[PDB]
Design a protein around this ligand. Structure first.
Ligand SMILES: Cc1cc2nc3c(=O)[nH]c(=O)nc-3n(C[C@H](O)[C@H](O)[C@H](O)COP(=O)(O)OP(=O)(O)OC[C@H]3O[C@@H](n4cnc5c(N)ncnc54)[C@H](O)[C@@H]3O)c2cc1C
Ligand SMILES: O=C(O)[C@@H]1CCCO1
Length: 281
């Protein structure tokens, strides 16, 4: 309705803190702005839990269009995908559709020297995502595909250790989803301690670690750990969501740490944006 135009625009203005815009062009412009401030980008097309196999494959094709556009602009493709957006769990001609679309995405990013992260979704998808991650590392190399472990899950430390033979690039996060006490630590102090164990164990193992958090107490303790263990500032990076603690993003880059910002865009922004709102301090 014409009467609702102002409210629709106001909601989008709220979301624009967290979402670059709705187009590939808006996302590329936002990454160029980050790079001018010494910060790297990690592109994501928004959307998840896509029901139709056709739409899952269209979504993968749109991620490929993004990778082509980034490359043509002189940006090394670094893209995060949710496998539920590209068909994970659905069979097409005897193979998992998420796996076959992820192969196409990673092959394209790798042609251009790029990288794909498999985001971690809710706990029901962890086993299949870790199985598919191991398969994809075998096909494309640990330099070209990474994944995520969530510190709120009891299983995560064991999962991290199980992956060490792959020398994998892993992003450590607290965890974005609603999870019961049989699956996830209810006490935030345990989530935060387990976060440190994941980062510290990954660094000691010599694997590339993405320290994805806006929690300054944790960030300061990671700086301390890296100093005490003689770890180079080329061996890991901090990561933050677009729009959150921009001051820290800039400060860390000025101190010579690597910083890479998760940079989402697209028309289907409601789910991601709703999680940002629910997280408000
Ligand atoms: C780059 C990146 C990628 C991620 N990828 C995944 C993934 O694939 N799967 C997954 O389950 N989780 C993922 N996460 C984690 C999930 O998004 C977090 O649980 C959430 O970001 C919690 O924020 P936090 O670690 O800053 O800490 P918190 O303890 O939640 O917050 C720490 C402080 O950060 C600031 N802050 C954090 N969030 C907000 C906000 N929404 N609004 C305003 N201030 C805020 C506040 O100052 C807050 O007190 C990712 C997080 C990051 C940073
Ligand atoms: O989708 C989300 O809310 C989180 C943050 C980025 C990747 O997974």
């Amino acid at each position: 309705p014409q009467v609702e135009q102002l409210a629709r625009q106001k909601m989008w203005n709220l979301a624009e803190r967290f979402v670059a815009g709705e187009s590939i062009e808006s996302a590329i412009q936002a990454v160029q702005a980050l790079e001018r401030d010494g910060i790297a980008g990690n592109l994501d097309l928004l959307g998840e839990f896509i029901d139709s196999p056709a739409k899952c494959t269209e979504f993968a094709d749109d991620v490929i269009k993004l990778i082509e556009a980034a490359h043509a602009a002189g940006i090394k493709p670094y893209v995060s995908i949710k496998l539920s957006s590209v068909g994970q769990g659905k069979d097409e001609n005897g193979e998992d559709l998420g796996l076959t679309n992820a192969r196409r995405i990673i092959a394209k990013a790798k042609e251009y020297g790029g990288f794909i992260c498999l985001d971690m979704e809710d706990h029901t998808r962890v086993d299949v995502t870790l199985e598919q991650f191991r398969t994809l590392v075998g096909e494309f190399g640990a330099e070209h595909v990474g994944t995520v472990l969530q510190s709120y899950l009891y299983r995560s430390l064991g999962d991290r250790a199980s992956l060490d033979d792959l020398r994998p690039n892993i992003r450590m996060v607290k965890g974005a989803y609603l999870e019961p006490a049989t699956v996830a630590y209810p006490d935030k102090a345990d989530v935060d301690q387990n976060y440190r164990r994941l980062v510290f164990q990954h660094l000691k193992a010599g694997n590339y670690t993405n320290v994805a958090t806006h929690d300054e107490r944790i960030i300061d303790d990671v700086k301390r750990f890296v100093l005490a263990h003689g770890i180079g500032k080329d061996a890991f990076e901090f990561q933050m969501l677009y729009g959150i603690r921009r001051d820290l993003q800039k400060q860390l880059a000025a101190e010579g740490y690597r910083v890479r910002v998760y940079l989402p865009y697209g028309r289907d922004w409601y789910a991601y944006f709703s999680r940002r709102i629910a997280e408000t301090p």
